[PDB]
Amino acid sequence: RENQVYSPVTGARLVAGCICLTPDKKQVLMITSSAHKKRWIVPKGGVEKDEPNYETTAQRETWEEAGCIGKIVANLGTVEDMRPPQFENSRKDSEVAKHPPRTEFHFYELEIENLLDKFPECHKRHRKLYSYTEAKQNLIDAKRPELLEALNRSAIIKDD
Ligand SMILES: O=P(O)(O)CP(=O)(O)O[C@@H]1[C@H](OP(=O)(O)O)[C@H](OP(=O)(O)O)[C@@H](OP(=O)(O)O)[C@H](OP(=O)(O)O)[C@H]1OP(=O)(O)O
Ligand SMILES: [Mg+2]
Ligand SMILES: [Mg+2]
């Protein structure tokens, strides 16, 4: 139902989520897409009308989707799903035809404080820690470069 919030400018869906890291920052928590059941992504979901801020949405989604609790330690800013629902070539480069973003993502970095075995989606998703290299490859395999950009902005140790 239309409890969902949209950018008054672009019409993009507003979504918040978490890059969840281990205290030592060597791993990131990933979950399986419910739709695309073999794609590994990060916890996120739609902002609802009642929610006062993006952090609220981000921590709600991180609990509901991954059973993960912790503390927001950084604002990672915004990224856009630029997937289209066909090309235009500018002489030394080529691009997809102009369209509004599907989704504007507000990401936060979270330091994991607990992972619980029971959570709302624990029967609908898998959840696993990954090092930077494996996480990067997951997000390429999932076709989600915008979630990789959010990961890259995080304090995750990349020197593997
Ligand atoms: O229910 P919420 O969490 O509040 C809201 P969502 O944003 O979490 O639910 C997502 C939504 O599906 P739908 O609206 O039908 O529920 C997306 O469709 P789109 O953004 O194009 O409108 C879909 O992205 P796409 O890959 O199909 O393009 C995404 O799959 P993905 O996991 O990100 O790959 C779904 O996430 P899942 O929670 O199912 O994993
Ligand atoms: Mg949701
Ligand atoms: Mg979601």
From Swiss-Prot:
Binding site for 5-diphospho-1D-myo-inositol 1,2,3,4,6-pentakisphosphate: R13, S33, S34, K44, R83, R125, R144
Record text on cofactor binding: Binds 3 Zn(2+) ions per subunit.
Keywords associated with the record: Cytoplasm, Hydrolase, Magnesium, Metal-binding, Nucleus
Reaction(s) this enzyme catalyzes, per UniProt: diphospho-myo-inositol polyphosphate + H2O = myo-inositol polyphosphate + phosphate; P(1),P(6)-bis(5'-adenosyl) hexaphosphate + H2O = adenosine 5'-pentaphosphate + AMP + 2 H(+); P(1),P(5)-bis(5'-adenosyl) pentaphosphate + H2O = adenosine 5'-tetraphosphate + AMP + 2 H(+); [phosphate](n+1) + n H2O = (n+1) phosphate + n H(+)
Residue numbers binding 1D-myo-inositol hexakisphosphate: R13, S33, S34, K44, R83, R102, R125, R144
Enzyme Commission no: 3.6.1.52, 3.6.1.60, 3.6.1.10
Family annotation (SUPFAM superfamilies): Nudix
Binding site for Mg(2+) 3: E61
Binding locations of Mg(2+) 2: E61
A GO term, aspect molecular function: bis(5'-adenosyl)-hexaphosphatase activity
Family: Belongs to the Nudix hydrolase family. DIPP subfamily.
Biological function: May eliminate potentially toxic dinucleoside polyphosphates during sporulation. Most active against diadenosine 5',5'''-P1,P6-hexaphosphate (Ap6A). Can also hydrolyze diadenosine 5',5'''-P1,P5-pentaphosphate (Ap5A), adenosine 5'-pentaphosphate (p5A), and adenosine 5'-tetraphosphate (p4A) are also substrates, but not diadenosine 5',5'''-P1,P4-tetraphosphate (Ap4A) or other dinucleotides, mononucleotides, nucleotide sugars, or nucleotide alcohols.
Protein name per the record: Diphosphoinositol polyphosphate phosphohydrolase DDP1
Organism: Saccharomyces cerevisiae (strain ATCC 204508 / S288c) (Baker's yeast)
UniProt lineage: Eukaryota, Fungi, Dikarya, Ascomycota, Saccharomycotina
